């Protein structure tokens, strides 16, 4: 069953931006309803935990700029696994998240902190979301080769040979 | 494709050149007349 690749997949939510608008405060809230947000990530678990509790270079800059991002670490350091964190922000139109997974290897002999490993690239441009360059290059080259093949077969069709002259047109 | 066609065509042109070289380069009674002219001249003299 034909599936559109998620790298080119682009979601638009006019109702959400009309109701709430685009801001770093609710950029994760905007991302929550997208298909790219896995329901198995620990961010959703933290979200239900918060809901139950209520019912009952630029990395350091964005680190020190917002306190909710702080709360994100102090709620995310306890849970290791696939997590969604912000990468960088330039207002009022550009935001990009950092898709990384954490394995807090607390074993004896490792003086390093929890291991952070990239998984995917996500770019929020306007109200749209974008998600390999190797594929782009090979696709461009293969389409170029197809066009070249068509041109060369047409040119060879145009070619006419005679023994007494050689090849002419 | 290009190489096969070019080689065959070159061979054919070579054969024709050989044939052309073959074609080009290979370098390799009186008395009766007396009476004939005598009769001719006397006939003209009579007829002139």
From Swiss-Prot, chain A:
Record keywords: Activator, Nucleus, Phosphoprotein, Transcription, Transcription regulation
UniProt-annotated location(s): Nucleus
Organism this protein belongs to: Saccharomyces cerevisiae (strain ATCC 204508 / S288c)
Similarity-based family: Belongs to the Mediator complex subunit 6 family.
Protein name, UniProt field: Mediator of RNA polymerase II transcription subunit 6
Residues of the full protein shown: 1 to 202 of 295
Membrane-traversing stretches: none
Main function: Component of the Mediator complex, a coactivator involved in the regulated transcription of nearly all RNA polymerase II-dependent genes. Mediator functions as a bridge to convey information from gene-specific regulatory proteins to the basal RNA polymerase II transcription machinery. The Mediator complex, having a compact conformation in its free form, is recruited to promoters by direct interactions with regulatory proteins and serves for the assembly of a functional preinitiation complex with RNA polymerase II and the general transcription factors.
GO CC list: core mediator complex; mediator complex; nucleus
Any GO MF annotation of the entry: transcription coactivator activity
Keyword presence, Glycoprotein: no
Subunit structure: Component of the Mediator complex, which is composed of at least 21 subunits that form three structurally distinct submodules. The Mediator head module contains MED6, MED8, MED11, SRB4/MED17, SRB5/MED18, ROX3/MED19, SRB2/MED20 and SRB6/MED22, the middle module contains MED1, MED4, NUT1/MED5, MED7, CSE2/MED9, NUT2/MED10, SRB7/MED21 and SOH1/MED31, and the tail module contains MED2, PGD1/MED3, RGR1/MED14, GAL11/MED15 and SIN4/MED16. The head and the middle modules interact directly with RNA polymerase II, whereas the elongated tail module interacts with gene-specific regulatory proteins.
GO biological process, one term: regulation of transcription by RNA polymerase II
Note: Present with 4824 molecules/cell in log phase SD medium.
From Swiss-Prot, chain B:
Note: Present with 2181 molecules/cell in log phase SD medium.
Effect of mutating residue 25 to K: In SRB6-1; suppresses the phenotypic defects of an RNA polymerase II CTD truncation
Whole-protein residues included: 62 to 119 of 121
Family from the record: Belongs to the Mediator complex subunit 22 family.
Subcellular locations according to the entry: Nucleus
Domain of life the protein comes from: Eukaryota
Functional summary from the UniProt entry: Component of the Mediator complex, a coactivator involved in the regulated transcription of nearly all RNA polymerase II-dependent genes. Mediator functions as a bridge to convey information from gene-specific regulatory proteins to the basal RNA polymerase II transcription machinery. The Mediator complex, having a compact conformation in its free form, is recruited to promoters by direct interactions with regulatory proteins and serves for the assembly of a functional preinitiation complex with RNA polymerase II and the general transcription factors.
Quaternary assembly: Component of the Mediator complex, which is composed of at least 21 subunits that form three structurally distinct submodules. The Mediator head module contains MED6, MED8, MED11, SRB4/MED17, SRB5/MED18, ROX3/MED19, SRB2/MED20 and SRB6/MED22, the middle module contains MED1, MED4, NUT1/MED5, MED7, CSE2/MED9, NUT2/MED10, SRB7/MED21 and SOH1/MED31, and the tail module contains MED2, PGD1/MED3, RGR1/MED14, GAL11/MED15 and SIN4/MED16. The head and the middle modules interact directly with RNA polymerase II, whereas the elongated tail module interacts with gene-specific regulatory proteins.
Identification of the protein by name: Mediator of RNA polymerase II transcription subunit 22
């Amino acid at each position: 069953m034909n599936v559109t690749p998620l790298d080119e997949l682009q979601w638009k939510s006019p109702e959400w931006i009309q109701v709430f608008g685009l801001r770093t405060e609710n950029v994760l809230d905007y991302f929550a309803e997208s298909p790219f947000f896995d329901k198995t990530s620990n961010n959703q678990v933290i979200k239900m935990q918060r809901q139950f509790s209520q019912l009952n270079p630029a990395r350091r800059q964005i680190l020190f700029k917002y306190p909710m991002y702080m709360q994100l670490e102090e709620e995310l350091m306890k849970l290791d696994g696939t997590e969604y964190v912000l990468s960088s922000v330039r207002e009022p139109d550009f935001w990009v998240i950092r898709k990384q997974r954490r394995t807090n290897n607390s074993g004896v002999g490792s003086a390093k902190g929890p291991e952070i490993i990239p998984l995917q690239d996500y770019y929020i441009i306007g109200a749209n979301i974008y998600q390999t360059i190797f594929k782009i290059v090979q696709s461009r080259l293969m389409s170029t080769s197809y066009h070249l093949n068509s041109t060369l077969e047409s040119l060879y069709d145009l070619i006419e040979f005679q023994p007494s002259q050689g090849v002419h047109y | 494709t290009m190489q096969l066609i070019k080689n065959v065509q070159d061979l054919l042109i070579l054969t024709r050149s050989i044939k052309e070289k073959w074609l080009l380069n290979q370098i390799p009674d009186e008395k009766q007349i007396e009476e004939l002219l005598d009769n001719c001249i006397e006939t003209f003299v009579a007829e002139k």
